[PDB]
């Protein structure tokens, strides 16, 4: 069954005669919803996907230079010029260099000097805008502990369809009213994805290119180092890969995954309202399971203090009510604690069918009691309704 | 001639009858040494090279992972084990994961989990120890303004040979006594070299390998990210290239060059002592240049306020003394200022030979006077001995 093994598991109880139940859905989390005379339901958020995202800005984190050229003038002959100064693909810088008789000038003193290089981007990171209108939440709704699908439903929630109705066979129907970023971008850097704040992403000190789309880079000087060697010559060297520095600057930032055109979100929470009104209990008109039950394995405690029990039923008596409870004294068999797998029913009309049960035992000593009469099975339990009523067989 | 065009140029004056002159030699710098009745000498530090350096430590700045494996145990079954835990090539991490009926365990709760990956270094930076005993300084010594080598000497200074003697032909000999790091390393990262402090280099948060040379890396965890995804699984991803982050962390650090086995230093200074004792003036026994001088181009001011003059001498009269000075009044021709190209002599016995002169003019108005009598050449000069004496020709 669902939720039993989950560490991040929530237990929500709906009021008697109530219609709505408030639920908060986390990634890798389960919510077990219980209600008086209603079946216990499991609600889990499977996936959160953002699709059709528009590119807002690209940043160069690894670059390469080529086609280097230089120009210089004599001390009073004005500023140095290169055709590459007008080319957007070229990164250029103007300085002053020592000129004189020894290097082709009639005068001594500082002369203008320009250096140019063709900038090429080797690797880039992209930032995409998250549209709240293109979000897709995939929720799983299950009847907690129904026999082995009819009793489970996969629903898709979107701003276009924030209201969904799930049919759970003989357990009726369940309604979901949910509320599916205003300052977040979707960052992609070499198959690694992140959710970053608009302000931080805008201030990145790397060569950039805004919008869609050879290309033309702005602030190419961020990955290109222009050095002045003792006022004798100007050198140009590319800085190298910044992905590691960007990674460290992304300390504590939210991660993400890919699906080709859709981006899977690994974090966030979804607030919902559950319409319990149409949920119904299965087997209110059934007879009680008369044959013997046997434990297929020893009962085990979950991470939340509850007890999971697997039983095999020897009977062939169609769909019947499973007698299951906990008692502190074996004489009067007064019910203690409660059943999470509320009002359990066997659906199989064939022998030795299996059933999974979940009980919420009281604190201290108690017994797990499955079945009725002499053929009933017991197991002592130590910690730290939902049970079908029946006549006295003892 | 040397030093005239150099911006970082020093002028040092030696006392009359003096033996030693203290000099500090910088990279891309010139020192013009002047002394009474001695030839003017140019001293320049050409190269500083450190050879035969022993490797002290290698740091991985870009890595790659492969051969990923995992192992897990059930809640009470103890710690997870992999053979890769004992392998030095493998980076491993132990954690706790949710275990239960749904994933192969009889009990629910946290179970031990280990994850391993084969670490491979793609790119590395090396740190080498600078031995003071393996330093080599190459110094250039020139006679400042001698005619067009005999009057120049290339000397090599090492801790093995910190004393050197340079022969300058007819200008005698010159002695050099110099003093050729205790907390510095030679860093190499993808053809780029640096001089870094021992303390900083030792604290680098990257996978390392000490000494010579499967290889075996320590602190592989610095480039490998082990993530825990909602206590359900452990992921392993390599961080990527750190060269950019290392580059930025090397803010203000000294740079360097290569020669295959030798490392060129672009910074530092060399303190020396010059033995002026054996230096002699050329042409004290020569006659005066009787023929006419002509300016080959207009005199030019250097970056240090001095004046450079190029003259052509029409005479065929062998080696003679060049009449050159500055005067404020053309009548008495009393010498003002001084000559940097002290006691100039023509060596060529062939006509129209060329000579370069350097004068230190007084402040304000003065005249450059080359030659004697009616055939002498003049040029007016405005700013902001070393002259051969001769009889009156005026």
């Amino acid at each position, epitope marked *: 069954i669902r939720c039993i093994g989950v560490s991040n598991r929530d237990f929500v109880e709906g009021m008697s005669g109530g219609t709505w139940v408030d639920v908060v859905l986390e990634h890798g989390g389960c919510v077990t919803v219980m209600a008086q005379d209603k079946p216990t339901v499991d609600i889990e958020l499977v996936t959160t996907t953002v699709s059709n995202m528009a590119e807002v800005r690209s940043y160069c984190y690894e670059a390469s230079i080529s*086609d280097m050229a230089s120009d*210089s003038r004599c001390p009073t002959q004005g500023e140095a010029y290169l055709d590459k100064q007008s080319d957007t693909q070229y990164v250029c810088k103007r300085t002053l260099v020592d000129r004189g008789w020894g290097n082709g000038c009639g005068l001594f003193g500082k002369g203008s000097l320009v250096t140019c290089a063709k900038f090429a981007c080797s690797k880039k990171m992209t930032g995409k805008s998250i549209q709240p209108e293109n979000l897709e939440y995939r929720i799983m709704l299950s009847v907690h502990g129904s026999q082995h699908d009819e009793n489970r439903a996969k629903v898709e929630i979107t701003p276009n369809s924030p209201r969904a109705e799930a049919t759970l066979g003989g357990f009726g129907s369940l309604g979901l009213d949910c509320e599916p970023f205003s300052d977040l971008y979707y960052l992609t850097m070499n198959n690694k994805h992140w959710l970053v704040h608009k302000e931080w992403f805008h201030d990145i000190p790397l060569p950039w290119h805004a919008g869609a789309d050879t290309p033309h880079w702005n602030n190419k000087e961020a990955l290109v180092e222009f050095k002045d060697a003792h006022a004798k010559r100007q050198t140009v060297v590319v800085l190298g890969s910044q992905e590691g520095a960007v990674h460290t600057a992304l300390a504590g930032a939210l991660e993400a995954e890919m699906d080709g055109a859709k981006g899977r979100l690994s974090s966030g929470h979804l607030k919902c309202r559950l319409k319990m009104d149409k949920l119904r209990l299965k087997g209110v008109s059934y007879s009680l399971c008369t044959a013997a039950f046997t434990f297929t394995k020893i009962p085990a405690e979950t991470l939340h203090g509850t007890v999971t029990v697997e039983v095999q039923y020897a009977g062939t008596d169609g769909p019947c009510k499973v007698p299951a409870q906990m008692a502190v004294d074996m004489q009067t068999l007064t019910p203690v604690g409660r059943l999470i797998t509320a009002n359990p029913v066997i659906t199989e009309s064939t022998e030795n069918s299996k059933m999974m049960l979940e009980l919420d035992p009281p604190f201290g000593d108690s017994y797990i009691v499955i079945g009725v009469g002499e053929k009933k099975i017991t197991h002592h339990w130590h910690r730290s309704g939902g049970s079908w009523s029946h006549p006295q067989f003892e | 001639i040397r030093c005239i065009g150099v911006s970082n140029r020093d002028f040092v004056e030696g006392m009359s009858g003096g033996t030693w002159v203290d000099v500090v030699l910088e990279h891309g710098g010139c020192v013009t040494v002047m002394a009474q009745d001695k030839p003017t000498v140019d001293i320049e530090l050409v190269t500083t090279t450190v050879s035969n350096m022993a490797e002290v430590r290698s740091y991985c700045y870009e890595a790659s992972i492969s051969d990923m494996a995992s192992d897990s145990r059930c809640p009470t079954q103890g710690e997870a084990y992999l053979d890769k835990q004992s392998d030095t090539q493998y980076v491993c991490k132990r954690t706790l994961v949710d275990r239960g009926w749904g994933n192969g365990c009889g009990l629910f709760g946290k179970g031990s989990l280990v994850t391993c990956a084969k670490f491979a270094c793609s790119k590395k930076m090396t740190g080498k120890s600078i031995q003071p005993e393996n330093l080599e300084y190459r110094i250039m010594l020139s006679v400042h303004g001698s005619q067009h080598d005999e009057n120049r000497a290339k000397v090599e200074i090492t801790p093995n040979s910190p004393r050197a003697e340079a022969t300058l032909g007819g200008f005698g000999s010159l002695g050099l006594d110099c003093e050729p790091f205790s907390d510095l390393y030679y860093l190499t990262m993808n053809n780029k070299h640096w001089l870094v402090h021992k303390e900083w280099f030792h604290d680098i948060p990257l996978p390392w390998h000490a000494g010579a040379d499967t290889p075996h890396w320590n602190n592989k965890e610095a480039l490998v990210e082990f993530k825990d995804a909602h206590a359900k699984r452990q992921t392993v991803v390599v961080l990527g290239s750190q060269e950019g982050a290392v580059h930025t962390a090397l803010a203000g650090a000294l740079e360097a060059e290569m020669d295959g086995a030798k490392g060129r230093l672009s910074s530092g200074h060399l303190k020396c002592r010059l033995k002026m004792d054996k230096l002699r003036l050329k042409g004290v026994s020569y006659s005066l240049c009787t023929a006419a001088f002509t300016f080959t181009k207009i005199p030019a001011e250097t970056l240090h306020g001095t004046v450079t003059v190029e003259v052509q001498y029409a005479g065929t009269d062998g080696p003679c003394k060049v009449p050159a000075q500055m005067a404020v009044d053309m009548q008495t021709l009393t010498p003002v200022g001084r000559l940097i190209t002290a006691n100039p002599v023509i060596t060529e016995s062939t006509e129209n030979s060329k000579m370069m002169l350097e004068l230190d003019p007084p402040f304000g108005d003065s005249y450059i006077v080359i030659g004697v009598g009616e055939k002498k050449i003049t040029h007016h000069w405005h700013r902001s001995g070393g002259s051969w004496s001769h009889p009156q020709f005026e």
Partner: antibody
Amino acid sequence: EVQLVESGGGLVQPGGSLRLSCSASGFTFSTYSMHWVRQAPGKGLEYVSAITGEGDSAFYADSVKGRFTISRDNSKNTLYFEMNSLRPEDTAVYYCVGGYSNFYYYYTMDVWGQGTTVTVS
Amino acid sequence: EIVLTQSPATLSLSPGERATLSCRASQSISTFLAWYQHKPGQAPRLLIYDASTRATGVPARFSGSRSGTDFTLTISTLEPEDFAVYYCQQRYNWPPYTFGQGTKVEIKA
């Protein structure tokens, strides 16, 4: 003795490619700026290209700009001239010229190669 | 763009005679002018640099002179080996280090 021995010359088609080489000996190659000078039949000498000693900066005349590429390998002591999109106007004897330089492309004294002939028909 | 204009186009002389070759620069280039000798089947040979400095092994009969933007190469007494094409080359500031069109020094009929 200081020498420049060139090769790579030959007969080529219009729009074709060719690569010239110029091997150097008798001097430290990195201390010399290298230049390409050409002479078309019946014409004078033409300065077309230049490269600094370290090979970090290159110059091209408007006549060869875009089509021709100058390069050097200081470990191999060789100068190269990649010629693409060759026109009949490019038919000439090509000379590699070298001169000791301590400032970009400037030189006083020089050394010339024997010359190699490039023909475009 | 610096232009060098050589004159005359052809100089027809006998051995022993004086050859005076001219080169005018389109603008002031100080003394950054070189002279070359070019014989058939041979590469050009540098004769003079810095307008008046004779290169290594260049004989005394070759001399360079200058008056403003006007440059002169004089071959005082022509020897049989001096009949060739002569070029001037400007080396002012930055490339192109342009050449003159050339002067042919030919044997007189």
